[PDB]
Design an enzyme around this catalytic site. Structure first.
Site, PDB file in Angstrom:
ATOM      1  N   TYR A 154     -12.220  12.999  -0.566  1.00  0.00           N
ATOM      2  CA  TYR A 154     -11.655  12.134  -1.779  1.00  0.00           C
ATOM      3  C   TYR A 154     -12.554  12.555  -2.946  1.00  0.00           C
ATOM      4  O   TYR A 154     -13.714  12.427  -2.989  1.00  0.00           O
ATOM      5  CB  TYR A 154     -11.918  10.845  -1.756  1.00  0.00           C
ATOM      6  CG  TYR A 154     -10.981  10.258  -0.678  1.00  0.00           C
ATOM      7  CD1 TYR A 154     -11.150  10.140   0.527  1.00  0.00           C
ATOM      8  CD2 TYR A 154      -9.596   9.814  -1.086  1.00  0.00           C
ATOM      9  CE1 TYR A 154     -10.392   9.396   1.460  1.00  0.00           C
ATOM     10  CE2 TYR A 154      -8.737   9.280  -0.043  1.00  0.00           C
ATOM     11  CZ  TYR A 154      -9.231   8.966   1.173  1.00  0.00           C
ATOM     12  OH  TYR A 154      -8.526   8.201   2.121  1.00  0.00           O
ATOM     13  N   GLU A 160     -11.187  13.806   6.191  1.00  0.00           N
ATOM     14  CA  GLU A 160     -10.552  13.578   4.984  1.00  0.00           C
ATOM     15  C   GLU A 160     -11.656  13.302   3.807  1.00  0.00           C
ATOM     16  O   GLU A 160     -12.724  13.048   3.849  1.00  0.00           O
ATOM     17  CB  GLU A 160      -9.899  12.186   5.193  1.00  0.00           C
ATOM     18  CG  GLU A 160      -8.715  11.981   4.051  1.00  0.00           C
ATOM     19  CD  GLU A 160      -8.231  10.543   4.280  1.00  0.00           C
ATOM     20  OE1 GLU A 160      -8.786   9.626   5.089  1.00  0.00           O
ATOM     21  OE2 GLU A 160      -7.207  10.465   3.887  1.00  0.00           O
ATOM     22  N   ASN A 210       0.943  -1.154   0.125  1.00  0.00           N
ATOM     23  CA  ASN A 210       0.154   0.123   0.049  1.00  0.00           C
ATOM     24  C   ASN A 210       0.697   1.274   0.053  1.00  0.00           C
ATOM     25  O   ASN A 210       1.714   1.379   0.793  1.00  0.00           O
ATOM     26  CB  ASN A 210      -1.070  -0.179   0.884  1.00  0.00           C
ATOM     27  CG  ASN A 210      -2.064   0.950   1.219  1.00  0.00           C
ATOM     28  OD1 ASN A 210      -2.716   1.501   0.033  1.00  0.00           O
ATOM     29  ND2 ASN A 210      -2.433   1.510   2.089  1.00  0.00           N
ATOM     30  N   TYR A 241      -7.283  14.323  -3.030  1.00  0.00           N
ATOM     31  CA  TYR A 241      -7.740  13.819  -1.750  1.00  0.00           C
ATOM     32  C   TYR A 241      -7.127  14.915  -0.943  1.00  0.00           C
ATOM     33  O   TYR A 241      -5.896  15.579  -1.084  1.00  0.00           O
ATOM     34  CB  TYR A 241      -7.673  12.425  -1.515  1.00  0.00           C
ATOM     35  CG  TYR A 241      -6.503  12.102  -0.699  1.00  0.00           C
ATOM     36  CD1 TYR A 241      -6.484  11.946   0.496  1.00  0.00           C
ATOM     37  CD2 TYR A 241      -5.120  12.048  -1.482  1.00  0.00           C
ATOM     38  CE1 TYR A 241      -5.167  11.565   1.282  1.00  0.00           C
ATOM     39  CE2 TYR A 241      -3.875  11.959  -0.759  1.00  0.00           C
ATOM     40  CZ  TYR A 241      -3.906  11.679   0.562  1.00  0.00           C
ATOM     41  OH  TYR A 241      -2.825  11.275   1.106  1.00  0.00           O
ATOM     42  N   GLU A 248      -2.844   6.346  -5.459  1.00  0.00           N
ATOM     43  CA  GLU A 248      -2.979   5.400  -4.403  1.00  0.00           C
ATOM     44  C   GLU A 248      -2.913   4.045  -4.935  1.00  0.00           C
ATOM     45  O   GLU A 248      -3.744   3.841  -6.004  1.00  0.00           O
ATOM     46  CB  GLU A 248      -3.993   5.526  -3.655  1.00  0.00           C
ATOM     47  CG  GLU A 248      -4.482   4.397  -2.675  1.00  0.00           C
ATOM     48  CD  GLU A 248      -4.715   4.776  -1.141  1.00  0.00           C
ATOM     49  OE1 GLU A 248      -4.949   6.079  -1.167  1.00  0.00           O
ATOM     50  OE2 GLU A 248      -4.470   3.859  -0.266  1.00  0.00           O
TER      51      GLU A 248
END
Lengths: 370, 184
Positions: free
Chosen positions: B79, B77, B34, B68, B171
């Site tokens: 996105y 947060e 990740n 984001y 990501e």
């Protein structure tokens, strides 16, 4: 049906232990290495010569020794144990399709009575312990034969909010992610229920921690939910900690300040001098390279415990009372904070542990009933 | 033009990220756990128009091509996911908004004792605008972030008053891939 059985998992804040609802708005402590389901009772038959009974006492726990079945529940925190006998009770949960709770279910299970003095140091509201280690009287084996499903369980421990326990197989949750679950063997150790895996090597950042040829034995990594932090044998602690601190000191990150060591951690810091990234606190990544060709990553959220506001300590603690390379003792006991936001598939039938670190932007608590 | 660079990996696999000239960045990655890589601004703004050109978007597995960022007061947060790999992220449905030639669904999700810009153990809501189908890549593309802000506001999703980083990111997870993205 014979459908898998789901319970939500709570991380108790004061203890850092994990529980699941049991019955009557009472809960049990998940203890992955535990052999029994036990709780207190209100004021069930089976002979102490029976296979069941004998299997329940086949690996006498530390303090304890060994006509109705007398079993010997122990407390995973204190190590206290006590005589008590077995009684049928109900484990109330829901069945699952893998994605959500479908229908309520009471699963007939056998638990040992324990006296209330045995609840010491367990979470408020808890009446006992859900032993998960592979066996006879552990919760997954009883759910299996009680519900006619695989002797297999799944944990996704949360940092906060409800995580997941599924007993009995079925589709994996988070199928968008878990199609790529990696797998490592469960290694058999002598006289021991527990869950062991093998790591060839530990990496701090991009570089291997100089630890022998094979001290990260076969099955030298144990999993436990009894502590939040990781325990390391002497021959692994100093080198891992040293590599971790040198890599820490090489960070464009704030310069970390060491503060007054809080026990049992002998390495703490002021959180205003740790940076923050998507992994949690900006400290080096520590990867276990597991049999299976896949690594178990730890980032800040796993490798650092927020002990009190302002301080966070490295979650590697040394084993005391122990020689370097004492085969009997595991080289690494990985704790609950090192398993949080991992989907862990404990497949006792195929002698394997599925593991998958979920993406940084979600967690175990995102499971559920739209 | 951009003043913020993000390059995080959880250590899994290989993640080769290049902080190119101006607002340009690339990532080539394989066998990952990740990572998140991007460029944008140290200080986000609800009125920013993000322009980007993703000259390569080649995920094999999970990966997200997304704007984001964060607010504090409160800690949110957010996105805006313009494209993805194998899986399209979702959550609690709140509504849909048309912007920049696309239709996005608006989702919220919540995180408990989770990492954030405020610490390792924190609680917050995430807001998402996720496009209904993958935005074509290769040409200049606009995210009129106000359209998203206003549509979130119209559905009870208020952002904090103070704006921290805001990045056009790549990501990637349990996957391989290449990305080449230029932000202005």
């Amino acid at each position: 049906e014979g459908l898998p059985v789901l319970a939500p998992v709570t991380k108790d804040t004061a203890t850092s232990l994990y529980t699941i609802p049991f019955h009557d708005g009472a809960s049990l402590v998940l203890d992955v290495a535990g052999l029994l389901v036990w709780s207190t009772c209100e004021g069930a038959e089976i002979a102490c010569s029976s296979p069941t009974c004998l299997l329940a006492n086949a690996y006498p726990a530390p303090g304890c020794p060994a006509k109705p079945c007398t079993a010997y529940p122990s407390n995973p925190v204190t190590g206290a144990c006590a005589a008590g006998s077995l009684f049928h009770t109900r484990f109330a949960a829901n069945t699952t399709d893998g994605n959500k709770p479908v229908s309520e279910v009471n699963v007939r299970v056998l638990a040992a009575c324990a006296p209330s003095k045995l609840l010491a140091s367990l979470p408020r509201g808890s009446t006992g312990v859900a032993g998960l280690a592979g066996s006879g009287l552990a919760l997954p084996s009883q759910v299996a034969s009680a519900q006619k499903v695989p002797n297999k369980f799944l944990l996704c421990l949360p940092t906060g909010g409800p995580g997941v326990a599924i007993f009995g197989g079925g589709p994996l949750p988070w199928p968008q992610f878990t199609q790529s679950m990696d797998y490592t063997p469960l290694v058999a150790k002598g006289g021991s229920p527990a869950h062991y895996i093998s790591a060839r090597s530990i990496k701090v950042e991009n570089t291997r921690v100089p630890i022998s040829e094979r001290a990260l034995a076969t099955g030298g990594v144990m999993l436990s939910t009894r502590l939040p932090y990781v325990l390391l044998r002497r021959d692994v602690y100093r080198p891992l900690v040293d590599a971790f601190t040198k890599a820490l000191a090489a960070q464009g990150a704030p310069v970390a300040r060491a503060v007054k060591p809080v026990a049992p951690f002998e390495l703490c810091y002021d959180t205003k001098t740790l940076g923050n990234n998507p992994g949690g606190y900006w400290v080096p990544n520590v990867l276990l390279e597991l049999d299976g060709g896949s690594d178990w990553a730890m980032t800040g959220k796993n490798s650092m415990v927020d002990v009190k506001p302002g301080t966070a300590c490295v979650a590697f603690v040394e084993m005391k009372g122990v020689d370097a390379g004492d085969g009997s003792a595991p080289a690494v006991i990985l704790g609950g904070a090192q398993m949080e936001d991992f989907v862990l598939d404990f497949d006792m039938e195929k002698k394997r542990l599925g593991f998958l670190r979920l993406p940084h932007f979600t967690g175990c608590s995102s499971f559920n009933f739209a | 033009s951009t003043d913020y660079w993000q390059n995080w990996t959880d250590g899994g696999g290989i993640v080769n990220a290049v902080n190119g000239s101006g607002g340009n960045y690339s990532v080539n990655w394989s066998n990952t756990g990740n990572f998140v890589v991007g460029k944008g601004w140290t200080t986000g703004s609800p009125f920013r128009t993000i322009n980007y050109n993703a000259g390569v978007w080649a995920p094999n597995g999970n990966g997200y091509l997304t704007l984001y960022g964060w607010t504090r007061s409160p800690l949110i947060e957010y996105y805006v996911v313009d494209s993805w790999g194998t899986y399209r992220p979702t959550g609690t449905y709140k509504g849909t908004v048309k912007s920049d030639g696309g239709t996005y669904d608006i989702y919220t999700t919540t995180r408990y004792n989770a990492p954030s810009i405020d610490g390792d153990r924190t609680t917050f809501t995430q807001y998402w605008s996720v496009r209904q189908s993958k935005r074509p890549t290769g040409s200049n593309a606009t995210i009129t972030f106000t359209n998203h802000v206003n549509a979130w506001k119209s559905h009870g999703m208020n952002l904090g008053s103070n704006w921290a980083y805001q990045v056009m990111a790549t990501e990637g997870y349990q996957s391989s891939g290449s990305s080449n993205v230029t932000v202005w």
